[PDB]
Amino acid sequence: TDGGITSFVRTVLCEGGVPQRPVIFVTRKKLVHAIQQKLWKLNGEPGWVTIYGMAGCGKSVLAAEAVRDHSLLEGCFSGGVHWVSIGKQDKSGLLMKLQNLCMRLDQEESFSQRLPLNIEEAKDRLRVLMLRKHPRSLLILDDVWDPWVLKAFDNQCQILLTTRDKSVTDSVMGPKHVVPVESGLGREKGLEILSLFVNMKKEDLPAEAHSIIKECKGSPLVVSLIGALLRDFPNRWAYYLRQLQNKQFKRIRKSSSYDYEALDEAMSISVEMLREDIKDYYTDLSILQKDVKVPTKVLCVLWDLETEEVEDILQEFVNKSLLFCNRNGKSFCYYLHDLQVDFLTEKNRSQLQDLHRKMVTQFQRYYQPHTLSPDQEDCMYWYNFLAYHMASANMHKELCALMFSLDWIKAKTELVGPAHLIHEFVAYRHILDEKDCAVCENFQEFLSLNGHLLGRQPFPNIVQLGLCEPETSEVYRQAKLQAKQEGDTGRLYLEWINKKTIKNLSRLVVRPHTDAVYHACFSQDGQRIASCGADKTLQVFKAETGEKLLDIKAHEDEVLCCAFSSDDSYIATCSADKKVKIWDSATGKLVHTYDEHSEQVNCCHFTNKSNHLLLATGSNDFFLKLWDLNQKECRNTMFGHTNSVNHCRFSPDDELLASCSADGTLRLWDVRSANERKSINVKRFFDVEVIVKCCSWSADGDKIIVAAKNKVLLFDIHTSGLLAEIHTGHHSTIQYCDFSPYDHLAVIALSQYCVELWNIDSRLKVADCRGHLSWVHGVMFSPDGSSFLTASDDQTIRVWETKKVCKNSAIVLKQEIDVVFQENETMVLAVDNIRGLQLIAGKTGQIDYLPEAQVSCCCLSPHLEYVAFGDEDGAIKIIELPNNRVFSSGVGHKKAVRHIQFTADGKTLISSSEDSVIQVWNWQTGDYVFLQAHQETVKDFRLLQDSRLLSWSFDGTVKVWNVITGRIERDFTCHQGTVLSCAISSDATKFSSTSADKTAKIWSFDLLSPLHELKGHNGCVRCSAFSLDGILLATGDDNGEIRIWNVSDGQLLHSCAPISHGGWVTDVCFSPDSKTLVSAGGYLKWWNVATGDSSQTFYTNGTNLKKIHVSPDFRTYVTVDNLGILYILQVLE
C-alpha cells in the first residue's frame, strides 16, 4: 500500500470505472509489474494481455493495479482505460453489458442517442468510439468465460482481460500474451494481509497464523475474509483455526467442491458472526446474481429504507469483505465475488424463491411496471431483471401480467430494444403461458413482426402496430381498447380491415430456439423435425404439433446443419467448432463425435439406403469427408474443391455423392471409392466467381438441381447438360432451396425472408409463401413432399402444407391494382401474383378470380360490370363481369402494356405501353384513335375534362391530346428530361403541374412557359398534388423529402420532411379540408399543413408503395406493398 497515484491516474481510473483497492491491500509488485510489461509489449499495436488463474487468486485486483501507474497510463494508454465487468454471460447477458458500456462511452451521444439494440450493432457502435473519440485507450475485460465474447471486442483495440480459463483467446486472432497468477500468495504475503487486518506485525502474530494461511490455501479472498474475523474477534484465533480445520460446511452435491471448501468455511463463519439484526439483510443478498453490481435504491425498496441508512448497513458488510462496491457516480452499487454468490445460494437454497418473491412485492409496493422513469438509478436493474425475479419466484399471475402487456413492451423496448424480451418469452414460456391459452404466441408473434420497429427512433405508436394483429389476439384487444379509451383526441387510428385475408397462415409454427435457426429438416418418415441454430443446441419436435421431443446442448458454437440417418435411428449435427456429432434420436445421448475438419463444417447428410450407414460432411476447409458410423475413424477425405464446400447430398441410389462449393463447381464423387468422377463449372454469369448452395437430386437420381446467385439450374447427371434455367427473384441471391419428389416442385428461400416455390419443367413461380419478416436460412420438403418447413433468423420454424400453399389465392397480389370506392363498400381489382387478377371486395372476402395469360396491368370501369387488362405481349382485353365470361380483344401494342384506363363513360379504353403511341380503342364499335406522340415513351397519362387527355413522356414533354380527334391541342417542353408524374388542379383546371428529376415546374396550360420553377428538392421530385382548391402543391422527393408549396406562381412554403422517409415518396394527397396531407413511400405517413407532421403511423410490412388510394371521406385507404400484401385501411370507429 502506498502512492503511485497522480490525481491524473485518479481521474483516468475513476472515469474508466476501474474499481479501487480492497479494504486491506498488499502489494504484489512482482506480478503487477509482469503484467505492465506485457502491456508495453503491445506497443501501439492492438492485441491481448490475459491474466489467468483460479478464482479469488487476485486477478481483478491485479489488473486494476497494473493501470494504476502514470508511467504506464500516459505514453501508452494516453486516452485512458475502460473497465467492463462481464463474467459468465449468454447472448442477452452480453448485450445488457455492451448496452451499458455504450451509455458510458457516448455519454454526450457524440454518435447517436439510444443504446445499441443487439450484439452485432453494439459491436460496431463500439469499434468507432474506440477508434476515434477514445483512441489509444485500454479496455479491461473482467472475468471472461467464453471465446465468442472476446469476439465483439475484437475490433483493433488493446485489451487486458482476466479469466479462470486460459483459453478464452483461442478463438481470437492478434498478438496475445499471458500472465499466470498462482492460486495463492505466500505465507509471508498471506501473513501480511492478516498482519494488516488485525493490527500487529507478524511478530505478535499468534502461532496459528502460519497455520491459518495454510487452510485458506493462500487465497486472498479467503484470507481477507478470515483476517476480517480475527480482527472483529481478537481472542478466538485458535478457535477459528479449528473451524477452518474441519470444514463443517455441508453442501448438497458434496462431490469435488474445489475453492468452496476454504471459502465456504470462511464465509459460513464470518456470516454466522454478523449482529442479530443485519443478519437477515445479508440473507436477502442471496438473490443478488453473479456479476451484477446493484445500485443502492434497489435495496431501499427491498428493505423499506432510505439511501444513507442502507449504505451504512451495507458498509458493515463491505468492512468484513462480505460485500464489495464501487462508485457509479455519487450513488453506490454493490456486488459479490462469484464465489460468495455460490456460497449464499447453496446455504440459503430453500429460501431463494421466497427472497425473490419478497423482491417484486416491494417493487409493487413502490412502483408500477410501466412507470419507472429513466432517471432512477435502479431504472435499469428493474427493466432487465424484474421479469427475472418474478420467474425466479415462480409467480404465474405476476409474471404473465407483466409480459402480456403492451405498456411493458412499449416502456422497455423504447429503452433497450426488443432483443431481451424476445429471449424472455422463450425462456419463461413454461412458467408463463400454459393453461390452454395462446396469449403467449400472440405476444411472441407480435414481437416477431414488429421486432424490427420496436426500439428504433422514432419509437412507433405501439397501439397502431397492435391494431394490425388478428382480431382474436390479446395484443389486438389490448391495443383496440387502448384506442377506444381515448376516442377523440386528434389521433384517429387506421384499421386494417382485410388484415384477416392476408397472412399465408402456416399450418404450424414452432419456436424452440433463443437465437437464429440456421437449418431444420424432417425425419425419414416425416413424423419429426430437427432444427439447429446459433443458440448452439439441437432441437427435435413432432412434425404434427411442434410438441418438443429433444432439447440438447449439441455444441460449443453455432450449429450449421443437422440430419437424420436412413432409419431415423440417428441425427448428426456439424458446427462451427469444426466438429460433427451423432446422437441417438430417441434419447439424445451423444453417440460419439468426429473432430477432423480444419474449418467449420457446413454440409452433413446421411446415406438414403437403409442398408449402409455413412455420413458425408463438407467444410470451409475445402474437404469432404465420409464417416463410417460403425468406426471410431474417418473413412475417406475427398480432396478436390478449390474453396469452401457448402453442401452435399448422397444420390438416392447411394452410389454417388454430389457436392456443391464456392469454387463454382458441382461435383460427383464416387462413394464406394471416394474418387472425383465429374465436375461441373457454373459459368452462367458474366472472370466472376459464383457460389453454389443447396443441391438435391431428382427422384430417379438422373438429374440434379442447384442454386447459384439469382438462378436455380437443372443438370443432367450424365451428359452434364443444363436442362433448365429459371431466373429467380430478379437480382438478389438464393440463400437455400429443396427439390420436391413430385410435381417437379422446388422451394427456395429467395432473398431475405421471401419464400417462393417454383415449378421446374414449367419454369414458372407457383406460390408466394409469406411467413417471415427476418432472413430465411433454410427450407425443405417433407419426405413425401406433401409439406415443407421454413427456418429463419426470427428464430422460428414453420411447417407448411404444399397443396394448400400452391392453391391460387388473393392473399398475395402484385402492386398493379385499381380501386373503386363505392360508398357502402370498397372494390379492389388486382393483378394476381402468379396468373390472372382478383376482384377483391374489401369489407367482405368475396374474392373472384379471372384467369389469364399473366396480365401486366389492371383497370376497372366505373359501375364495375367491366374490367380491362394489359398484357406482357401488348394484348388488351375487356371482360364483362355481369357475365364473368364473354369478353373482347382489341388488337394492338408492341411492348408490354403499362397504364390502362376506361373513359369517363364505359366505352373507349385509353392505354399506353413502352413506346410513343397511346391507343384509344373505342371498343363496342371497333374504332381506334392513335396518338403518335413521336416522343420517346409515354411515361404515363390520365383522362381529363371533356374527352381531352393529359400526357407526359420522358422527353420533358407534356401534351394535351383530344380523343375522338387524335389532335395535339397543347404541347409543352417543361423539362429537359423524363417527366415523372404531374397532376391537375382539378378545380377549374387553370393549373396542372409537373415533377421530373430536378424540380416541380407548375403552369396554366396557356403560357408556353412555366409559371415558376420550384428548385427545392435535392433528391428529385417523383410525385405531387394540388390542394382541393386550397392553394398548395405538395411534391414528392426521391429522398423521403416533401416540401409544401403555395399556388401563387412561385414561393417556397414549409418543407415538412424528416428522415433522421423510408425510401422514396411515391405519392401524396391533400384532404378535402385542405389541412391533412397523406403520404406514401416506404410506408404511409400523415401530416399537418403548416409545420409539424402528424399520425406518422402505419408501417406496412413491406415498403416501396406506389399510389395510395385515399377516398372521398378521407376515411378509407388502399395500397399494396412489395410484399404483395393488400392493405385496406379505414379510420377507427
Ligand SMILES: Nc1ncnc2c1ncn2[C@@H]1O[C@H](COP(=O)(O)OP(=O)(O)O)[C@@H](O)[C@H]1O
Ligand atoms: N493483493 C491483495 N491484497 C489484499 N486483498 C486482496 C488482494 N487480492 C485480492 N484480495 C481480496 O480478494 C478480493 C478480490 O478478489 P479478485 O481479485 O476479484 O478474485 P479474482 O481475481 O478471481 O476475480 C478482494 O475483496 C480482496 O479482499
